[PDB]
Enzyme design. Structure first.
Site, PDB file in Angstrom:
ATOM      1  N   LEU A   1       0.797  -1.247   0.000  1.00 56.57           N
ATOM      2  CA  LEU A   1       0.000   0.000   0.000  1.00 56.57           C
ATOM      3  C   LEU A   1       0.826   1.292   0.000  1.00 56.57           C
ATOM      4  O   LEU A   1       0.325   2.356  -0.375  1.00 56.57           O
ATOM      5  CB  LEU A   1      -0.957   0.048   1.197  1.00 56.57           C
ATOM      6  CG  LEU A   1      -1.647  -1.209   1.712  1.00 56.57           C
ATOM      7  CD1 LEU A   1      -2.263  -0.889   3.064  1.00 56.57           C
ATOM      8  CD2 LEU A   1      -2.692  -1.712   0.728  1.00 56.57           C
TER       9      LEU A   1
ATOM     10  N   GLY B   1       6.114   6.629   6.308  1.00 61.08           N
ATOM     11  CA  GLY B   1       7.203   7.119   7.148  1.00 61.08           C
ATOM     12  C   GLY B   1       8.344   6.131   7.242  1.00 61.08           C
ATOM     13  O   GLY B   1       8.930   5.748   6.229  1.00 61.08           O
TER      14      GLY B   1
ATOM     15  N   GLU C   1      -6.881  -1.064  10.958  1.00 60.19           N
ATOM     16  CA  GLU C   1      -8.050  -1.055  10.095  1.00 60.19           C
ATOM     17  C   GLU C   1      -7.645  -0.664   8.680  1.00 60.19           C
ATOM     18  O   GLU C   1      -7.017   0.381   8.469  1.00 60.19           O
ATOM     19  CB  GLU C   1      -9.097  -0.081  10.634  1.00 60.19           C
ATOM     20  CG  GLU C   1     -10.346   0.040   9.770  1.00 60.19           C
ATOM     21  CD  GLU C   1     -11.360   1.037  10.311  1.00 60.19           C
ATOM     22  OE1 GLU C   1     -12.249   1.438   9.532  1.00 60.19           O
ATOM     23  OE2 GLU C   1     -11.287   1.422  11.504  1.00 60.19           O
TER      24      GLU C   1
ATOM     25  N   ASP D   1      -0.566  15.754  15.010  1.00 57.03           N
ATOM     26  CA  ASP D   1      -0.241  15.717  13.592  1.00 57.03           C
ATOM     27  C   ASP D   1      -1.462  15.403  12.741  1.00 57.03           C
ATOM     28  O   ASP D   1      -1.470  14.445  11.968  1.00 57.03           O
ATOM     29  CB  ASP D   1       0.897  14.724  13.313  1.00 57.03           C
ATOM     30  CG  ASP D   1       1.488  14.863  11.898  1.00 57.03           C
ATOM     31  OD1 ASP D   1       2.084  13.874  11.422  1.00 57.03           O
ATOM     32  OD2 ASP D   1       1.360  15.939  11.261  1.00 57.03           O
TER      33      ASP D   1
ATOM     34  N   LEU E   1      -4.325  15.931   6.052  1.00 59.09           N
ATOM     35  CA  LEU E   1      -5.070  15.169   5.054  1.00 59.09           C
ATOM     36  C   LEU E   1      -4.597  13.720   4.910  1.00 59.09           C
ATOM     37  O   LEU E   1      -5.421  12.816   4.765  1.00 59.09           O
ATOM     38  CB  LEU E   1      -5.044  15.878   3.699  1.00 59.09           C
ATOM     39  CG  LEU E   1      -5.723  17.245   3.643  1.00 59.09           C
ATOM     40  CD1 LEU E   1      -5.601  17.814   2.247  1.00 59.09           C
ATOM     41  CD2 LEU E   1      -7.180  17.165   4.055  1.00 59.09           C
TER      42      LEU E   1
ATOM     43  N   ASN F   1      -3.457  11.893   7.219  1.00 55.79           N
ATOM     44  CA  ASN F   1      -3.760  11.165   8.456  1.00 55.79           C
ATOM     45  C   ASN F   1      -5.243  10.946   8.675  1.00 55.79           C
ATOM     46  O   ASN F   1      -5.645  10.314   9.656  1.00 55.79           O
ATOM     47  CB  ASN F   1      -3.159  11.883   9.660  1.00 55.79           C
ATOM     48  CG  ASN F   1      -1.657  11.706   9.745  1.00 55.79           C
ATOM     49  OD1 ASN F   1      -1.091  10.778   9.159  1.00 55.79           O
ATOM     50  ND2 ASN F   1      -1.001  12.593  10.474  1.00 55.79           N
TER      51      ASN F   1
HETATM   52  C1  LIG Z   1      -6.474  -0.974   0.126  1.00 55.94           C
HETATM   53  O1  LIG Z   1      -6.370   0.289   0.800  1.00 55.94           O
HETATM   54  C2  LIG Z   1      -5.313   1.117   0.537  1.00 55.94           C
HETATM   55  C3  LIG Z   1      -4.819   1.245  -0.757  1.00 55.94           C
HETATM   56  C4  LIG Z   1      -3.746   2.101  -1.023  1.00 55.94           C
HETATM   57  C5  LIG Z   1      -3.223   2.216  -2.408  1.00 55.94           C
HETATM   58  O2  LIG Z   1      -3.968   2.094  -3.362  1.00 55.94           O
HETATM   59  N1  LIG Z   1      -1.900   2.430  -2.603  1.00 55.94           N
HETATM   60  C6  LIG Z   1      -1.265   2.559  -3.921  1.00 55.94           C
HETATM   61  C7  LIG Z   1      -0.192   3.656  -3.814  1.00 55.94           C
HETATM   62  C8  LIG Z   1       0.649   3.758  -5.091  1.00 55.94           C
HETATM   63  N2  LIG Z   1       1.247   2.446  -5.387  1.00 55.94           N
HETATM   64  C9  LIG Z   1       2.154   2.535  -6.541  1.00 55.94           C
HETATM   65  C10 LIG Z   1       0.226   1.395  -5.586  1.00 55.94           C
HETATM   66  C11 LIG Z   1      -0.635   1.217  -4.325  1.00 55.94           C
HETATM   67  C12 LIG Z   1      -3.176   2.825   0.043  1.00 55.94           C
HETATM   68  C13 LIG Z   1      -3.665   2.701   1.337  1.00 55.94           C
HETATM   69  C14 LIG Z   1      -4.738   1.840   1.599  1.00 55.94           C
HETATM   70  N3  LIG Z   1      -5.289   1.642   2.882  1.00 55.94           N
HETATM   71  C15 LIG Z   1      -4.797   2.043   4.127  1.00 55.94           C
HETATM   72  N4  LIG Z   1      -5.518   1.722   5.197  1.00 55.94           N
HETATM   73  C16 LIG Z   1      -5.137   2.070   6.426  1.00 55.94           C
HETATM   74  C17 LIG Z   1      -3.952   2.776   6.595  1.00 55.94           C
HETATM   75  C18 LIG Z   1      -3.199   3.113   5.443  1.00 55.94           C
HETATM   76  N5  LIG Z   1      -3.661   2.726   4.248  1.00 55.94           N
HETATM   77  N6  LIG Z   1      -2.000   3.829   5.560  1.00 55.94           N
HETATM   78  C19 LIG Z   1      -1.458   4.322   4.279  1.00 55.94           C
HETATM   79  C20 LIG Z   1      -0.464   5.488   4.530  1.00 55.94           C
HETATM   80  C21 LIG Z   1       0.489   5.441   3.309  1.00 55.94           C
HETATM   81  C22 LIG Z   1       0.618   3.941   2.954  1.00 55.94           C
HETATM   82  C23 LIG Z   1      -0.606   3.238   3.567  1.00 55.94           C
HETATM   83  C24 LIG Z   1      -0.898   3.139   6.243  1.00 55.94           C
HETATM   84  C25 LIG Z   1      -1.169   2.521   7.603  1.00 55.94           C
HETATM   85  F1  LIG Z   1       0.002   2.683   8.350  1.00 55.94           F
HETATM   86  F2  LIG Z   1      -1.436   1.156   7.436  1.00 55.94           F
HETATM   87  C26 LIG Z   1      -2.295   3.145   8.376  1.00 55.94           C
HETATM   88  O3  LIG Z   1      -2.061   3.566   9.497  1.00 55.94           O
HETATM   89  N7  LIG Z   1      -3.562   3.207   7.886  1.00 55.94           N
HETATM   90  C27 LIG Z   1      -4.585   3.840   8.730  1.00 55.94           C
END
Ligand SMILES: COc1cc(C(=O)NC2CCN(C)CC2)ccc1Nc1ncc2c(n1)N(C1CCCC1)CC(F)(F)C(=O)N2C
Ligand SMILES: [Zn+2]
EC number: 2.7.11.21
Length: 294
Positions: free
Chosen positions: A23, A27, A95, A140, A143, A145
């Site tokens: 995903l 950080g 989540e 912190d 957007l 977050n």
């Molecule tokens: C399928 O859903 C997603 C898809 C994509 C998605 O489509 N990403 C694409 C980005 C570009 N690449 C090239 C392909 C995948 C990104 C995030 C998703 N979902 C998600 N859910 C929860 C968290 C989170 N994300 N956070 C984000 C922060 C930045 C990286 C994850 C990280 C975390 F730490 F897990 C967190 O705390 N939370 C609360």
């Protein structure tokens, strides 16, 4: 070389997780779709390598993020479902917020329609209320977050700079890191408290309506000056009802900003249309909120 396991096993609860789609890098961490191999239930995995946690300092922040986040559960806070470690990595089971964050939405849409804002802001404020009620300052809010689930609901996440207020009227002196919409009383450095989160929200609001951050400059340090000098403009095309609220939240003196429990009571909300839910189309196409189809 030191790569990440294909299956993430928690020896404590005997839960096993299958590392799914990548995903992104939140950080110090790499984040993956992960599924419990038993319930088949899908989560977001925050995997942080211990090599980057060598210093007790970097390490305590990780522990604090966990300690705080685990204690929380609210409709508008990111579900914290567990954590564990092997020798090389720390795993946090969170989540899965499938519709990403207000950051991605902001980058597709820029400025939002007023009801969308109202809609989001309400949810932001509510989660934040839950935080403040539990003596937690996020510190912190941005957007990136503010995560969105399947139903386009806001889930406040990343408690990397969050902190518990341990006694009445405490003033936290140190902030270990640099937020996006960082408050002026943090940089003025005679302490700070909850009113920091309110400030952040002020900037979030501005951004949602204006389509850009209220301060954003070339230099980061540049941006820092005008924060403590309180230097921003609200565009003509913005409604006074909203603009007043923003001005109330973006005051340098912390004790002038409204408390979190005050906000939903603001004219901006109380005498404006707050949608019950948003259409998925809202990720791409501005909703008009008609009164009947065809
Ligand atoms: C399928 O859903 C997603 C898809 C994509 C998605 O489509 N990403 C694409 C980005 C570009 N690449 C090239 C392909 C995948 C990104 C995030 C998703 N979902 C998600 N859910 C929860 C968290 C989170 N994300 N956070 C984000 C922060 C930045 C990286 C994850 C990280 C975390 F730490 F897990 C967190 O705390 N939370 C609360
Ligand atoms: Zn530090």
């Amino acid at each position: 070389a030191k790569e990440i396991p294909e299956v993430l096993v928690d020896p404590r609860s005997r839960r096993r997780y299958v590392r799914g789609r990548f995903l992104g890098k939140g950080g110090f961490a790499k984040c993956f779709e992960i599924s419990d191999a038993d319930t088949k239930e899908v989560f977001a995995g925050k995997i942080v390598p211990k090599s980057l946690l060598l210093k007790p300092h970097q390490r305590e922040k990780m522990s604090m993020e966990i300690s705080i986040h685990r204690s929380l559960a609210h409709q508008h806070v990111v579900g914290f479902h567990g954590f564990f470690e092997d020798n090389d990595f720390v795993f946090v089971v969170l989540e899965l917020c499938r519709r990403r964050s207000l950051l991605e939405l902001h980058k597709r849409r820029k400025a939002l329609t007023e009801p969308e804002a109202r809609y989001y802001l309400r949810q932001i404020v509510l989660g934040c209320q839950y935080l403040h009620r539990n003596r937690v300052i996020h510190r912190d809010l941005k957007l990136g977050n503010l995560f969105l689930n399947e139903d386009l609901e806001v889930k406040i996440g990343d408690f990397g700079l969050a902190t518990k207020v341990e006694y009445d009227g405490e003033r936290k002196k140190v902030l270990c890191g640099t937020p996006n919409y960082i408050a002026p009383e943090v940089l003025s450095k005679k302490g700070h408290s909850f009113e920091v989160d309110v400030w952040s929200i002020g900037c979030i609001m501005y951004t949602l309506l204006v389509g850009k951050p209220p301060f954003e400059t070339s230099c980061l340090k540049e941006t820092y000056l005008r924060i403590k000098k309180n230097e921003y403009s609200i565009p003509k095309h913005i409604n006074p009802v909203a603009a007043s609220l923003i001005q109330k939240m973006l005051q340098t003196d912390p004790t002038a900003r409204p408390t979190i429990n005050e906000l939903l009571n603001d004219e901006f909300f109380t005498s404006g249309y707050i949608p019950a839910r948003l259409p998925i189309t809202c990720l791409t196409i501005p909703p008009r909120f008609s009164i009947a189809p065809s």
